[model samples]
Target: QYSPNTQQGRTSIVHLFEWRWVDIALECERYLAPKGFGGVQVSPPNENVAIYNPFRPWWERYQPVSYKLCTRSGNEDEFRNMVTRCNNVGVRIYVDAVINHMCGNAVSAGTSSTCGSYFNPGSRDFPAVPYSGWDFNDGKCKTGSGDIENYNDATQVRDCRLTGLLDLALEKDYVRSKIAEYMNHLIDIGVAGFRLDASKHMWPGDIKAILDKLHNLNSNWFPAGSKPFIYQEVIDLGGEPIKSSDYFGNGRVTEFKYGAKLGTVIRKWNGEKMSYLKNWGEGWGFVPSDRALVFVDNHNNQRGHGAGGASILTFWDARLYKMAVGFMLAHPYGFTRVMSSYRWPRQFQNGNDVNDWVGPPNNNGVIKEVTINPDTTCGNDWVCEHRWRQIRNMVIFRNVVDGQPFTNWYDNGSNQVAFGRGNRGFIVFNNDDWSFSLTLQTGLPAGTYCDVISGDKINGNCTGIKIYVSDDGKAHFSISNSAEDPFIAIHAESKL
Candidate 1:
């Protein structure tokens, strides 16, 4: 579970949020595998409710109606195709498993599931999985509202409904076996791992038991007895009774504090500055690096639903967002996941997006296929941040600098900071109001290297800024705060 099971030298996974399986298969071949991306954290592929009141909100995918491998993404056949195609090129696929619950207990009974499964949420009946009221936690919750209303109470948080979604009785062996069957089926189909959604809402013991029932990764693709990678989504930003460490025994936990603090520091909120990031990971009260899965902004927080504050950077904040992502990819703190998102009709009312519930780029009820522009950017409302020159180059930068220690740290006591990863890669950031100009030890071989953040190296030449490191392993770094990117990065692979 601790291992991501990626091919050698691949270090990052991008969340292709709400993307179709067909498109993902194409992406794996055309982009991800070639660009050194390790894997993709796909949206939940299980059958979910077909919500229309909010006109197909993205969250509807979280409300499972059956364990059948079908959703807006595609059917079972398409999913298998994606897994096979992606793994063939050494790009892994990690599923978003929403096993903690089912659809809202108050949703009207219907056969409106994405896979045409018949379910009655009020009675806890899902005939496709054949789960009855016996599989739910209706009798276990102690909360008055039958929902998780108090973070201070650990029991209710685990036993009650999350926003009225029907809580699963995972402690029961039968329920455990059912969920395990669904996951084992996925593993058999060549899936590499899973991103356990809403893991904080489930008990660690129950989660462990379900995992124990899973089969090893398909022998054709993985070595014998390779356990599937597990990264639980437990949003522990502190002040809660349920801590992220509680689930470390199961696998990695999403380090929510990583983004929250990084955002605050980048925005200079609460007197925080970039210099403070000198001690980035565990020093900032985050989980140990090995047990953490980190990201700048996730699907939930980008839409104002999770731990992130208004300061959290997203694709909408392209400038600072790139800086934050660049810093994360450069810093060896945790297993990083980049977010690839789609644009929605953002209508803010009283500081909140009234259209936060809007789904992906759909014509009426059908999702539109991703169109590639001549320049390789995504169209049809998709914000392919992973394809941005800055972010994508940094992804490869991380691959080149893998296993190198963070060294040659430099800061100006304020927002300007610079660091190097041993002799393989170096990066500099200028968040100060003025400019950053200094000769810093980069710990790289003396050569002219392309600044990947600003541009790319094409056919032995740089398309943008080029840095000439001296024989003493020092380079003169210069960046105006008003520069478009406000940062520059170079790696051994980009050296001339």
Candidate 2:
């Protein structure tokens, strides 16, 4: 019912998309827990059809073959170990659950060595899960060929195939039990929640039933009555009959529109223009704060697979991306999720290709194996945007400013903006092509503060840009990142 039932006072989740379980455990202990991230949204832990096509796309993880916790990320044992490790660090784990369907047509020709069976979508025989043609909702689909062709019809969308993936009949008691058992297994292992993939393609009642069957988080790791946090992926952009509201009864729904609104503000900011507060919520047809899962760009949209929009800020534009993400964290909005992605070309076709794993070195001197560099921009078709200094620093900024409300808003209607977070944090952005300065109300107690954006404080003094606010809360600041890196920031306690 709730996510991040905080083990401490921290609150914030990062989607460690496609990262290995061992890597996730190490991250929790090293970066996430120390930095105060509440949890991690991990890749689907369920068994998926091994896709050799395109050398292994990320979407192949979406094509589930069975409920077994086995995939490239790790096996069942490694997965449980990761959950226990993260839980011990006070960082929760949220698995990406793809229960709406089984493997798509492209994977039907493959065989599973673990299950000793062959699967063919043409025959609806997924022996890995022992699912047969009767397990599908083919008869209930309104479409002639039982494929999801119309989002306007609820039955067709829920009962038919999604992207040619074999649709499961969730209405069946056996199917519901099987799916619940799979989730319960994870729950017993120690996952805190789930990201229900393709929720729009399943019936809300079905989802509700599954949620009802899930066991509470293990008592050893969570409170006595902690319910697993559930959020569904329903991309409702106003024209579809399958709006997010339909699934709100079950749990939180991903607010796709928030990305567009944030993108709009970034465009105006980048263009040296100004817009009002524009907090990404109810105003843009999104659910209330409690029922929304907000983010800048997710794995699918950043790569242009699911619900592509122009306003999204990916790693392509680092300066603007920082501004957009920084703004989201600064403002009080829905639950926020920071995207941690690998490098890929703009038109990269294989969503599954590339080295998607992250972990410590083996006996082989591969101390840290990341195909994409964290410092430099990705060269071999991968973009590790999360590792950027600006982005990473803002993640810390966000953790510091959590629960703090926005105040002292100032905008010039063109190329300049400023705001303070409950007198605890203040930030400014100069998107103008040229340089400019302004004296603004900072709402912070008169003191010398470090500019978190430019640099961090070393010893008792800041080694980066310094900002001095007077007793009257007035501070002057300037930025000159061309049109690209035009932004400045300062926060409390960041001084010597």
Candidate 3:
């Protein structure tokens, strides 16, 4: 099932992309647990190709050099330690499992590397996994060169190499067994689940077979018989021959369209176009909540490389981005995953935006371990958007209002909107050209509540703005479009 098997009451996952295992462990203890996050999606810990010639690209990690559990992230020992520590603190770990294809760019047939695996692209051979020509789709690719050149044909997209990468014949029994073995090993080590990389390129039936052989979650960390939390990266923007629903029976499918549509709605050129979000679910073409894994922007989309093209909101667009993120958390749509990223070196800048391909900060080709600043935010050029008060505080808002339905909904027809979560929380946003103030029906019990959007609530006091509710649960809440945040959020637990 799509169940993430997270700690009870926890409901969000943060993609700790490219973080070293030791650093991840420290983060779990020092930040994640205290912040109330459900889990973290770590970078692929498997060994991958060492492409250093024209400069090591970020996508190289998707090219599996081996499954030995050794990489720039650290060795198997570090991975084990990180999982143990994170699990102890109620922060689960989900690995990025790249199983769709092997290394790309086979300009030469006999090319291979020393990073724990062997390969011969010329022979369709991978002795490391003991795969041979028979183990891959020999003539299934409709494209003459065997490279996926057409998106319109399902056979070419799924059965062929992606940009010259070695595509596996997962329909083969031997291939399925090898893939399952890799996943089972991780499950035995206590990882909560996986982000099946490039899953759209593999057929759903083949994936279900692999999941069927998977072992139950390690009882040491999760309940016995619990299945791993599997979310496949399926980028279907409708009208495509392949649909995301094909995989829902096996696990949740990444809802790439959710982020793209919300990004567009929030960035409405005139103003307040998002007010229609009063009904934002099945009507908008989003998959059902239980089977959809949603996000504002992922690693690929943030940099303009993946699906949905350049319209996505990234960390650079702080104000608008925060608003979109706030709305994502405030609205009940699908299972959510937030992104936590590091700062890349400055030279990789692609004009006014971050380079789409720049890997994590490193000394040449060697990865530099992650570091946190004294202020609890990350140093070394990291964006650390997840650490931003807007993001972190909303994590609490989500947990506070978990399982509650939308109530007391309000909209100004243009840019302003307000809503409450069945007396548990109330929030309002002004994206219009004017200021607004009124006795909004908060549906909360009478009390003075801290406005989490404005500042930190510490020592029983709110450092940011505060909202006061009268005995009747009506609060004088307002927002001006000119303000830095343009929003105010209050919940039952947001007491001042």
Which of the numbered candidates is closest to the native, going by highest TM-score?
1
Arrange candidates by TM-score, descending.
1, 3, 2
RMSD of each: 0.7, 4.0, 2.1
Candidate 1: stretches off by over 4 Å: none
- Score residue 128 of candidate 2 by CA lDDT: 68
Per-residue lDDT tens digits for candidate 1, residues 391-424, read 9999999999999999999999999999999899
- Ranked by lDDT, the better of candidates 1 and 2 is 1
Q: Comparing candidate 1 with candidate 3, which one achieves the higher TM-score? A: 1
The stretch of ten residues in a row with the least summed lDDT in candidate 1 is 303-312
Error of 1 at 69 (Å): 1.5
Task: For model 3, give the RMSD to the true fold.
Answer: 2.1
Q: Whole-model lDDT, candidate 3? A: 0.84
The residue pairs that clash in candidate 3, if any, are: 109-122, 272-415
> Candidate 2: lDDT over CA atoms?
0.75
Please list the residue runs of candidate 2 whose C-alpha ends up more than 4 Å from where it truly belongs after superposition: 110-118, 269-274, 346-368, 371-383, 481-484
TM-score of 3: 0.95
Clashes of 3: 2
Candidate lDDT (C-alpha), each: 0.94, 0.75, 0.84
User: Could you tell me how far off, in angstroms, the CA of residue 94 lies in candidate 2 after the best superposition?
Assistant: 0.7
Which sections of candidate 3 miss by over 4 Å?
105-116, 269-272, 345-354
